Each structure stands twice: as structure tokens, then as C-alpha cells.
Antibody
Framework: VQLVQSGAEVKKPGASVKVSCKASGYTFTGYYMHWVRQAPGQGLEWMGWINPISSGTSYAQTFQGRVTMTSDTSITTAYMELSRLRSDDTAVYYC??????????????????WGQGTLVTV | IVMMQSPGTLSLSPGERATLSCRASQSVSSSYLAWYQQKPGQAPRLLIYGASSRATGIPDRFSGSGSGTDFTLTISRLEPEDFAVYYCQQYGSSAWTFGQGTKV
């Protein structure tokens, strides 16, 4: 299982950033793709997830209304677009894999695979 | 929910044992408690899930335990690679919450 994210981005306040995450080594649509933010000197914050099979999403209240998650199964890639960027959106953004909610053994409760973080500076 | 890790910083010799604590503001099912290890310059990786179950590729030097509002991560023998930041994570109410992390 590999998760490969896009390179670092530098944006201005009010701009939007779209971070990609290319998945391989597993059935793409069999897992949820989560995004987790890590601001410098801070801990990990969950942003939301997308379910590639349905393109269904759920967002953390913190980012709801600013973050849009999409995916394209033909290239097994997930995307996270964070709009109206603020200076405090400077962070390393990770994509992470977790089981879907129908997983019997609660594999959805945790993130078993992470990509290399993508740094976005605002 | 609030996830509280302690101590913020832990320091001891290689070859020794370390215990990392994580406390919850409310009861957490063991199935919903996980631990991660984030080395300097690297993404977080899963160590423990379901409170006590090791993730694939994780040495048996790592173990987890606990229930309710009190969980721990134990490193029976610390190696140079183990001196990283560890996080506890909870799932519930359709949300994923991380602790502030502790540095070993």
C-alpha cells in the first residue's frame, strides 16, 4: 500500500489549494480516504473523508464550508481542495487510508496508511 | 471529546522501558482507541489499534492497553528510532480526534 501526495504549495490568503493523493497497492474504492492537517508545532487534526465508490464525503465542522473533497477512480487519486485560505492554514496535509464504516472489525476508527505530507504555506 | 496525553515530554535511556498515557474526557471503546508514531520529517504511522492490537510491521516491543478513559502505550525496550512523537487517537460521533502528542 502506497499513498503519494503532490509537492509543496505556496499560496496567498484568499487563494485555494488542491492537494492530490495517488493511491496504489490496494482496491481504491474499498477504503475511505481521509485528510489530516498538521500545523507547525501542532498535533494532528482530522479534516474529513471521501468514499471513492460514491464520492460521498463528511467534513469536520472546522473545515466544513471551506474544504471540498473529490476523487477519480480511473487514476486512483483523491483530492482535497481548501478554499479561502488563511494564514493559519499553513500546515502539512496528509492523506490517510481507513476502512469504510461497514467494516466489521472497526477498521474505520483508525488510519492504517499515510502518505508523505504535503506542505502548504499561506 | 478531548484526548489528554501525558507527560508532554518523556525522557529516558535507550534499552529502558517507557509508558505513555492517554486520558479521555469521556469513555472510549477499546476498538476506537489507536496510537501513532511520528518520526522527525516523517508522516505518522499506526502502531496500535483497538487499544492493544499491533499494526502490521510493528515490533512486539510495542504494546497497548486500557479501557474507558485510561489508555497506555508501552515500549518495553527503547531503540534510537523510538525517540519520536506519539499520538493517541479516538473515534466517535462520526469524528476522529487526536491527542496533543508526547515526545519521547
Amino acid at each position: 500500500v502506497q499513498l503519494v501526495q503532490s509537492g509543496a504549495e505556496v499560496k496567498k490568503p484568499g487563494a485555494s489549494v488542491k492537494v492530490s493523493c495517488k493511491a496504489s497497492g490496494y482496491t481504491f474504492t474499498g477504503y475511505y480516504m481521509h485528510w489530516v492537517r498538521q500545523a507547525p508545532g501542532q498535533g494532528l487534526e482530522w479534516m474529513g473523508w471521501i468514499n471513492p465508490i460514491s464520492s460521498g464525503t463528511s467534513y469536520a465542522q472546522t473545515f466544513q464550508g471551506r474544504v471540498t473533497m473529490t476523487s477519480d477512480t480511473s487514476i486512483t487519486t483523491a483530492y482535497m481542495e481548501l478554499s479561502r485560505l488563511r494564514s493559519d492554514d499553513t500546515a502539512v496535509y496528509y492523506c490517510a487510508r481507513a476502512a469504510p464504516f461497514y467494516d466489521f472489525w472497526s477498521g474505520y476508527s483508525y488510519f492504517d496508511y499515510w502518505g508523505q505530507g504535503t506542505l502548504v504555506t499561506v | 471529546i478531548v484526548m489528554m496525553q501525558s507527560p508532554g515530554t518523556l525522557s529516558l535511556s535507550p534499552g529502558e522501558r517507557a509508558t505513555l498515557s492517554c486520558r479521555a474526557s469521556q469513555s472510549v471503546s477499546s476498538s476506537y482507541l489507536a496510537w501513532y508514531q511520528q518520526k522527525p520529517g516523517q508522516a505518522p504511522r499506526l502502531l496500535i489499534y483497538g487499544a492493544s492490537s499491533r499494526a502490521t510491521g510493528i515490533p512486539d516491543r510495542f504494546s497497548g492497553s486500557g479501557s474507558g478513559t485510561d489508555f497506555t502505550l508501552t515500549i518495553s525496550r527503547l531503540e534510537p528510532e523510538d525517540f519520536a512523537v506519539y499520538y493517541c487517537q479516538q473515534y466517535g460521533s462520526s469524528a476522529w480526534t487526536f491527542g496533543q502528542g508526547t515526545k519521547v
